Amino acid sequence: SVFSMFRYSNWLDKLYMVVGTLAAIIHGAGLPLMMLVFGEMTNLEEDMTRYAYYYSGIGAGVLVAAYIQVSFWCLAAGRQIHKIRKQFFHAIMRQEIGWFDVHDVGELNTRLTDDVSKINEGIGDKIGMFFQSMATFFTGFIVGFTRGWKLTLVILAISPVLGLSAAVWAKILSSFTDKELLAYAKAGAVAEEVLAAIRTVIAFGGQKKELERYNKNLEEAKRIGIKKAITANISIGAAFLLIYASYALAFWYGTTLVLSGEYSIGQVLTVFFSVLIGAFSVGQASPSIEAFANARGAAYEIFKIIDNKPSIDSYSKSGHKPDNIKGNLEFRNVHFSYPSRKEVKILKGLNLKVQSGQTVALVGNSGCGKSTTVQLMQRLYDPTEGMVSVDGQDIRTINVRFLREIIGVVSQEPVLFATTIAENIRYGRENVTMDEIEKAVKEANAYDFIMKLPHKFDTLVGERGAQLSGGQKQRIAIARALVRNPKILLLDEATSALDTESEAVVQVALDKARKGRTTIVIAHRLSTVRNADVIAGFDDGVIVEKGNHDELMKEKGIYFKLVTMQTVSFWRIMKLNLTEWPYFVVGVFCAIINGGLQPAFAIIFSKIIGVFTRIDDPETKRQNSNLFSLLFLALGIISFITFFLQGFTFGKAGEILTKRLRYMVFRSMLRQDVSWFDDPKNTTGALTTRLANDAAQVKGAIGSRLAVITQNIANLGTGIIISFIYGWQLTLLLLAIVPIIAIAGVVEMKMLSGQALKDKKELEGSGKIATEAIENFRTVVSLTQEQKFEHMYAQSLQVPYRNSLRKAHIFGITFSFTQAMMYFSYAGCFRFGAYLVAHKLMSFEDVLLVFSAVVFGAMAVGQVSSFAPDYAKAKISAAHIIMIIEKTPLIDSYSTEGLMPNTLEGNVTFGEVVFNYPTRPDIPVLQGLSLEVKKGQTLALVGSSGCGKSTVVQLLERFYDPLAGKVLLDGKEIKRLNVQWLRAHLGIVSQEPILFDCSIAENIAYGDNSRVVSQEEIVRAAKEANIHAFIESLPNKYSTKVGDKGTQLSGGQKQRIAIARALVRQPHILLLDEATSALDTESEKVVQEALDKAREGRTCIVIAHRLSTIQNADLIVVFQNGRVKEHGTHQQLLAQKGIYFSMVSV
């Protein structure tokens, strides 16, 4: 699957790349020509000045070639970066729901960011650098062939071994990188899944277990990365060992020739200079081939997904969209099973039918397949066998886009995007008028509370619409469905958390327009289906009961059964590596040795020339040449050892540091309080992208790149030391030419710091958008807002794209100018040395040696410029990582200080509780209500929807500390009590709970952390929650893997599972927030009886909008305007004719 990375190369992109290749070739060819100059050098002041002028002229050519090469490659890389991101997100959004179910999804988020950053940020400039180095090696060989025939032939004959070794090591490195990126993606998926359910996790105190689960994937990634580092370092060390062995053999053959005299001393010296330059070119090349191998590895999975052509294309136009669409639908022999569990049969081939305006309600036992019916109708899943048809024409023939456009579906367990309410509604249809929105919301009985809040329609909802109460979220979803003005409404339990009055008004409003809308109302509050045209009774996947309400009651079947039952770190990050300092010590020592031995070739050449011209004894000359060759071979072996040691130690140090940074940042994010998760900046997608970006950037600036930079800086330092020692009044020239380099580097860093900060913020926003789309993928697919999300993602990426092009130009300027200035300095130093020699102030051999050292350093310095952008980005990435890790909220879950009472009676008292959500601090919700619950008393509260019911329990859970007031526990102020202790004792049933993607047994066991859960306990809890029977019923029993966020199991099933989870703790305090949100009255009665049997001894607070689950409540509290308007038992409240009587009667 090679070359796929260029699949999105535009003709302008191709021109960019080829021009860059030519420019890199030209730039590389220039350096060895300097060595060719020595060949001419090997009146003299005239030739010295001639060579100096030639070098000065070549300086501008090198300037232009470098700028062109770098800019073209970076521009192509940016274009590929943007095109690949766009097309990959397109492919992800194209996938049908089946592929979305079978495969893990949380991976895709971090896959995007990590893979793109590791693929294109690896191809772009590094490929150009590799072409430059290969061109330099080839040009060195060519000049050697010009000046010789034997030694150059030997070098060429030894080259293909190095070539084949590079190829094989690149292949293996890419293979390893595939698994490394898979491990990173698994870690990212775990992080995303945990963060989405942050409320539940902090409720059940599961931070440690999630942290360990993340650490597992982190450790796998660490191991794979260390393996890759070893592979790369071994490859490069072997290449250089072969290079030095070839050089030593060439030196021996030159000793053989000198006696023969076939080539002069100057000729062989020039050949050796060219070959040494070629070896250093290969040394510079190796990192680029490593990076390209990483790029291919990262491309593997991305293009695997891209080439995943689905069956239900959500973009093709191969269907019919007839103008006249009468809302008539019918199922026919619809055999269907979910691809998530192929075995289970859920639809036995039922057959329904409705006519335009006829409302066919679906009623039955929980999880009987109603949601499956609407899913199959929406063409999310193609039935195994069946002729599901609308207005005669089969659904399959019709075009999917138009079909879903004309269908409006309420999101059972509603899901709203992290935008403003206006836009949340606007997602219903593209072109929508504010008047239409007002009319729809009025129809939804939502205008009143919307106007109540400041920024009536400008108020923001959080992730998955968690900033609003369940009833408010349902009403907003109702508005979203209505605004589409659909011919086929798919109302799905839209009367779930609403207050009885709210449900009544919504039903009346829906009926007002039901005449022309083909609604399919699914509900369990049977009142909401009393006036339904047709009521469908589901059993075992088939419909038996039918007809209107009177006929259904006469049948005395399932429907009648239920009805009756109702009755800043440039040194801080380096500081953090205190536990690795042996690795840095060994690596820096080896890098210093390599740098010093780099220019040492000049001294070696000087000594060899002296030996060849010192004595007249051919035997002595042969002995000296043999000694020098042996020294070169030993130098090569030692260089192999040192290269591998330094490269490996720095690679392992980078990997370990990055893993520790990832673990620390994730743990810090878990530490942070829920309130911090409220801020729109901190959303799950943002956080996961933040991880995958910051950690990777810090790695990139602390990994083997730092190793190569230390090697190059040591090379430059030892070159300057050699120049100063052997020459004086010359190295001062280069030293005084450094200051422009210093200033240019400062300017480049200053610009790129801001550029990268802006790019990072934009990338965090884009990750937020992508994660919001993918996590709520079902809803967006149902609304066909995929195109809108793609546009949002492209618009968000727009800023990084322009910033990337700008960085391409900036870095091209910096690198090309630095190289050109270095070559001008070399030419000027040569001219000055010639002038001094004519002045009889320096021997020519010394000047030649110093020029050799300076040219070696000029070849070396090619890497610092390449490093500069990496350091620029990593500075800010680190800064943010340190900021996050150092953060500490008002309340710390890990904090073990405070009060930890041995035993709690379980009496909860609240007084003067005044609170407002920090998201909208101005708006008050609690009016200082006073409450008191004794041990073994199932207190309950009811009132108008979204009147702070969930807020009371959330304050009880210390999600937010009260703004003003005092809430105690057994006569002890909650604050004084250790947060973890209470969070363990208390139990929260949540609202529309999100179960994790694990084994159902594992999900239930999650309820009581810090102590293993015996299978007996889990099955007992399931039986108590009236699900153990079903749980055993399904294949694999408890091995079944609930989909991401519990999306696979039906609403009632996950409700019961959450009930069981909260039950496993057997808590002294049991807080239930609409535990019976979606349950058949029979199951509701069973669970209520189970709770009542255990009611005594376990103080309980239950909130629900169904009087049936609260009729026998110990004490019912009526909440109005945040205050306890009416409080009393069922008999007392019924005797009075206040709000409770009105709500019950309706």
Q: Which positions make up the binding site for ATP? A: 364-371, 943-950
CB burial readout 622-632, b (16+ within 10 A) else e = eebbeebbeeb
What are the CB-based long-range contacts (under 8 Å, 24+) for 790-793?
790/86, 790/89, 790/90, 790/93, 793/85, 793/86, 793/89, 793/766, 793/769
Nearer to Mg ion among residue 69 and residue 371 (C-beta): 371
CA-based R_g, the chain, Å:
37
Which of the stretches 125-133, 383-391, 947-955, 1007-1015 binds Mg ion when contact is defined by CB under 5 A? 947-955
Nearer to Mg ion among residue 495 and residue 814 (C-beta): 495
CA dist list (Å): 955 to 867, 916, 960 = 50, 11, 6
Nearer to Mg ion among residue 854 and residue 1143 (C-beta): 1143
Q: Which of residues 395-434 bind Mg ion (CB under 5 A)?
A: 412
What is the spatial distance between Cα 934 and Cα 905, in angstroms, rounded to a whole number? 8
Q: Give least dist CB 1051 to Mg ion, A.
A: 4
Q: Give least dist CB 366 to Mg ion, A.
A: 8
What is the token pair recorded at 481?
């469905």
- Check binding of 159 to Mg ion (CB under 5 A): no
- Closest-approach residue to Mg ion (CB): 950
Which of the stretches 98-106, 322-330, 991-999, 1012-1020 binds Mg ion when contact is defined by CB under 5 A? 991-999
CB 635 within 8 A of CB 210: no
CB 722 within 8 A of CB 602: yes
Which of the stretches 123-131, 548-556, 652-660, 942-950 binds Mg ion when contact is defined by CB under 5 A? 942-950
DSSP secondary structure, 551-563, as one string: HHHHHTSHHHHHH
Q: Which residues are annotated as a binding site?
A: 364-371, 943-950
Q: Cα 514–517–520 angle (5° rounding)?
A: 85
Q: Give least dist CB 778 to Mg ion, A.
A: 12
Which of the stretches 469-477, 527-535, 967-975, 1007-1015 binds Mg ion when contact is defined by CB under 5 A? 469-477
Q: Give least dist CB 812 to Mg ion, A.
A: 56
Helix (H) / strand (E) containing 909: strand 908-914
Nearer to Mg ion among residue 94 and residue 199 (C-beta): 199
β-pairing, 360-364 vs 488-489, is: unpaired
DSSP secondary structure, 1036-1075, as one string: TGGG-B--GGG-SS-HHHHHHHHHHHHHHT--SEEEEEST
What is the spatial distance between Cα 895 and Cα 1133, in angstroms, rounded to a whole number? 44
Q: Give least dist CB 371 to Mg ion, A.
A: 3
CB 864 within 8 A of CB 881: no
Nearer to Mg ion among residue 128 and residue 369 (C-beta): 369
What is the spatial distance between Cα 373 and Cα 356, in angstroms, rounded to a whole number? 18
Nearer to Mg ion among residue 419 and residue 1050 (C-beta): 1050
Q: Give least dist CB 98 to Mg ion, A.
A: 19
What is the spatial distance between Cα 819 and Cα 66, in angstroms, rounded to a whole number? 8
Q: How many of the other CB atoms lie within 10 Å of CB of 923? A: 13
Helix axes 704-726, 618-671, angle to 10 degrees: 140
Which of the stretches 130-138, 403-411, 656-664, 986-994 binds Mg ion when contact is defined by CB under 5 A? 986-994
CB 1114 within 8 A of CB 1102: no
Q: Which of 313, 301, 306 is nearest to 8 (CA)?
A: 306
- 283, 486, 541, 1051: residue in contact with Mg ion (rule CB under 5 A): 1051
- 152, 270, 816, 991: residue in contact with Mg ion (rule CB under 5 A): 991
Q: Which of residues 341-400 bind Mg ion (CB under 5 A)?
A: 371
What is the spatial distance between Cα 1116 and Cα 1126, in angstroms, rounded to a whole number? 8
CB 462 within 8 A of CB 509: no
Q: Give least dist CB 991 to Mg ion, A.
A: 4
Q: Give least dist CB 412 to Mg ion, A.
A: 5
Q: Give least dist CB 990 to Mg ion, A.
A: 9
- 122, 140, 188, 470: residue in contact with Mg ion (rule CB under 5 A): 470
Nearer to Mg ion among residue 498 and residue 769 (C-beta): 498
Nearer to Mg ion among residue 20 and residue 962 (C-beta): 962
- 937, 950, 951, 1099: residue in contact with Mg ion (rule CB under 5 A): 950
Q: Which of residues 65-94 bind Mg ion (CB under 5 A)?
A: none
Q: Which of residues 625-664 bind Mg ion (CB under 5 A)?
A: none
Which of the stretches 43-51, 177-185, 1034-1042, 1050-1058 binds Mg ion when contact is defined by CB under 5 A? 1050-1058
Query: One-letter amino acid identity for 430?
Result: E
Nearer to Mg ion among residue 825 and residue 950 (C-beta): 950
- Tell me, by CB under 5 A, how many residues bind Mg ion: 8
Which of the stretches 40-48, 124-132, 321-329, 1051-1059 binds Mg ion when contact is defined by CB under 5 A? 1051-1059
Q: Give least dist CB 1046 to Mg ion, A.
A: 12
Which of the stretches 10-18, 221-229, 467-475, 834-842 binds Mg ion when contact is defined by CB under 5 A? 467-475
Q: Give least dist CB 946 to Mg ion, A.
A: 8
CB 187 within 8 A of CB 218: yes
What is the token pair recorded at 703?
């990994």
Nearer to Mg ion among residue 459 and residue 1050 (C-beta): 1050
Query: Interface mask (CB under 5 A) for Mg ion, residues 794-823, using x and -?
Result: ------------------------------
What is the spatial distance between Cα 1008 and Cα 206, in angstroms, rounded to a whole number? 9
Judged by the rule CB under 5 A, the positions of this chain that interact with Mg ion are 371, 412, 469-470, 950, 991, 1050-1051
